[PDB]
Amino acid sequence: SGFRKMAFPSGKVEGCMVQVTCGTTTLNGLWLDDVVYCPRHVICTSEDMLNPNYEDLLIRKSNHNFLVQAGNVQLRVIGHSMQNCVLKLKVDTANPKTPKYKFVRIQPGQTFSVLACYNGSPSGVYQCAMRPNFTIKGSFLNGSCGSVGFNIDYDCVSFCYMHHMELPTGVHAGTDLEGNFYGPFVDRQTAQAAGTDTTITVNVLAWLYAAVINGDRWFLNRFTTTLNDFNLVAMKYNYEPLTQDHVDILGPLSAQTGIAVLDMCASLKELLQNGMNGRTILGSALLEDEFTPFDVVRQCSGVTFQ
């Protein structure tokens, strides 16, 4: 038993991280097959980032202006092309460590693991959620750009995020692996603001089920409620509204614990109005929303990967 903020094992992804340099800028890229993916702002200087014209900037770069290093090995760049906000560098050698992989664009509220890298070298791994305003609350220093977020489904790695920038508010923004930003952000150093960061209600509920599985039941209450009455309270507290799809997602957890989704909703409601009162749930004094219903099931049943 017990419950921990768990990340996916990162071995499959460590073998895909390379160091990409263009001019005097160095960041991380992702080496899959004979293509290296990296943030297109690798071709910018600190001054260019204020108002970059990436098309004009890229015209003055040739295949030999890009240095790709796989550890202490040199990859030869034989072709380049810009797709949205990523560069695609075609190299001469296919990565012998390419795993079964796919690209996916995730929805807000989904979770993934981030492998934070510097100079193509892994530094650490952590789990996070995509916030409803399409930012992530990460841990990134200079040179981490091109670090990637991923999920694992048995033997297949689903890449879903590449880090591109830190906003002036200290939160983080990036793209899918096709180069389309999550949210309305652009790869320019300018005052950009994110919308309201709401709590992911369906994830809070999954976590409350995990607490019950692990023996934290004090918050369970004798009331019940309806979807409408609950959503009207939730919205007052900047919680995402719950839909019937979210009720379907929580079905298996409802069956294991014997607690109806709507009964759990009525417990959460009382918590939103009356606070924790100094108590904790699974060692937390705040309501956690970085576990999805799938994550809870995965951890409480012991899924593995190869």
Tokens of 212: 């019950």
Whether 246 is catalytic: no
Contact flag: residue 125 with a second copy (CB under 8 A): yes
- Interhelix angle 201-213/261-274, rounded to 10 degrees, is 100
SS3 label, residue 106: coil
Q: Residue 40 carries which DSSP code?
A: G
The option from a second copy, Zn ion, none interacting with 145 (CB < 5 to 8 A, set by class) reads Zn ion
Task: Kindly state the smallest distance separating residue 106's Cβ from a second copy, in Å.
Answer: 18
145 is catalytic: yes
Strand partners, 80: 89
Using CB under 8 A, which of the segments 41-49, 59-67, 122-130, 190-198 binds a second copy? 122-130
The distance of Cα 71 from the centroid of its chain, to the nearest Å, equals 25
Nearest to 173 by CA among 198, 129, 136, 133: 136
Token representation of residue 221: 């209450």
- For residues 73 and 141, which CB has a smaller minimum distance to Zn ion in the complex? 141
Of residues 11 through 70, those in contact with a second copy by CB under 8 A are: 11-12, 14-15
For Zn ion, the binding residues (CB under 5 A) are: 145
3-state secondary structure of 174: strand
Residue 172 binding a second copy, by CB under 8 A: yes
Taking CB under 8 A as the binding criterion, the range among 43-51, 116-124, 196-204, 253-261 that sits at the site for a second copy is: 116-124
Site string for a second copy, 276-305 (x = CB under 8 A): ----x--xxxx------------xxxxxxx
Indicate the residue among 9 and 251 with the shorter CB distance to a second copy. 9
Beta bridge partners of 111: 129
Rounded (10°) CA dihedral 33, 35, 41, 43: 140
Element spanning 257, H or E: helix 251-257
* Nearest in space to 3 (alpha carbons), one of 302, 206, 211: 211
Q: If contact means CB under 5 to 8 A according to the sort of partner, which of Zn ion, a second copy, none does residue 256 touch?
A: none
Rounded to 5°, angle at Cα 95 from 89 and 100 = 105
Specify the residue, 145 or 281, whose C-beta has the smaller distance to Zn ion.
Answer: 145
Q: Which of 38, 85, 128, 145 is catalytic?
A: 145
Q: Is 128 in the site for a second copy (CB under 8 A)?
A: yes
User: Which residues lie near a second copy (CB under 8 A)?
Assistant: 1-12, 14-15, 71, 115-119, 121-126, 128, 137-144, 166, 170-172, 214-215, 280, 283-286, 299-306
Q: Which residues are catalytic?
A: 41, 145
